[PDB]
Design a protein around this ligand. Structure first.
Ligand SMILES: NC(=O)Nc1ccccc1
Ligand SMILES: NC(=O)Nc1ccccc1
Ligand SMILES: [Ca+2]
Ligand SMILES: [Ca+2]
Ligand SMILES: [Ca+2]
Ligand SMILES: [Ca+2]
Lengths: 87, 146, 87, 146
């Protein structure tokens, strides 16, 4: 039987969070790059601003990714439970 | 993604673990009750996401055919040796790969659902391979998952 | 400056969940092993029972681990925000 | 875990991002407001865990010295190249390593906070290295993180 083995691992709400956050990672990556490498004169208030927006977007995508891992393991809990009936 | 006959029947039994009122349909409410009985605490949105993922027709609940179809997708299993080793590591106070027979008995008779002192006797007899009163839990877990 | 770099990654409530769940992983690992390898006569109802308890405990530890990763990234969000003032 | 003078001063500025009422103390309520302004949604228990981790004296709030001490522990950074590449990959519809200049403009002028069509002009000028109207986003991200 299956003994100690378990299901092997690896929405619209999350999907909107991903597209907006990812677009913002692109936005702030670009604006930080521009403001640190393509200017004669670095404006640090500008860099700080886009650094804050960059970290918020990166951490938003991390949050979605973590929630998907969580959802995936919740589903796998249910599949594992169902598989006990295979014994 | 192809299931045998015996498995289709076994999974009908499985469906009743979820369909708590037996009305032929699993709802978010029933999945909440089940998940909590398994010591998890999904949010309403997470319950809804778990129904929606396999809710083929969008009527808000999962039927047996939606449930069966889905299982076919996820039949692959993998060994749990490393996860089990990591559970033992929780009790490895000194981080040295060992848990004493005394500490193992203490854990098993006080934490979680617990074992009887007689059941612990049997566990330690198997676990303490060298008879030195110490459990190399990596080796023990390898023995049990072999 | 820091440009696009971010903080490098990697409770009592969680701690109790870990010790109880881990003890139960040990419990059910043992009982499944016993009932599948150290008996003359396998009792499948027994194996099924301990398989259900085993998957619940394993998935409880996964849940704690995921929550710790989540907490860690929430803290790292705050540290990242604080580091914008280094610019 | 050792901080310079300028950094101690910069982190006093940082403390005010959190201490929203300026009363010298950061509470779970203030961390909730801040985290939500960053588009996250920590639970009450998570907010409490974040205070408690660095709450040296156990009075329930974080002071500047508790805050400063803590930062010293976490000064190490790491490059974000792969995470940034993965953000671009969200828009790689065909999974082929490319996003067209047209699709990039469409994304950047409609999703998130957005760029002006003029700002997008500048971005694409840099991104489309080969002048072929296509962005190899792995290469572009490597350029920006170099
Ligand atoms: N997503 C998912 O696996 N949902 C589920 C699993 C078992 C029963 C009912 C629903
Ligand atoms: N755990 C943790 O990092 N908490 C925190 C961070 C910044 C400000 C206030 C609290
Ligand atoms: Ca029902
Ligand atoms: Ca349905
Ligand atoms: Ca305050
Ligand atoms: Ca304190």
């Amino acid at each position: 039987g299956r003994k100690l083995e378990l299901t092997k691992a690896e929405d619209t709400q999350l999907t909107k969070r991903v597209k907006n956050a990812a677009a913002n990672v692109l936005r702030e990556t670009w604006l930080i790059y521009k403001n640190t490498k393509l200017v004669k004169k670095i404006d640090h208030a500008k860099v700080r601003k886009h650094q804050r927006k960059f970290l918020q977007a990166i951490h938003q995508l991390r949050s979605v990714k973590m929630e998907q891992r969580k959802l995936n393991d919740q589903a796998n809990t249910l599949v594992d439970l169902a598989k006990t009936q295979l014994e | 993604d192809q299931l045998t006959e015996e498995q289709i029947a076994e999974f009908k039994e499985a469906f009743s673990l979820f369909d708590k009122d037996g009305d032929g349909t699993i709802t978010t409410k029933e999945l909440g009750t089940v998940m909590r009985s398994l010591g998890q605490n999904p949010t309403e949105a997470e319950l809804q996401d778990m129904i929606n993922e396999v809710d083929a027709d969008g009527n808000g609940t999962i039927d047996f055919p939606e449930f069966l179809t889905m299982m076919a997708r996820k039949m692959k299993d993998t060994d749990s040796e490393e996860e089990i080793r990591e559970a033992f590591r929780v009790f490895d106070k000194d981080g040295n790969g060992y848990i004493s027979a005394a500490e193992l008995r203490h854990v098993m008779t006080n934490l979680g659902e617990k074992l009887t002192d007689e059941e612990v006797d049997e566990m330690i007899r198997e676990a303490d391979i060298d008879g030195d009163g110490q459990v190399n839990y990596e080796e023990f877990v390898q023995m049990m998952t072999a």
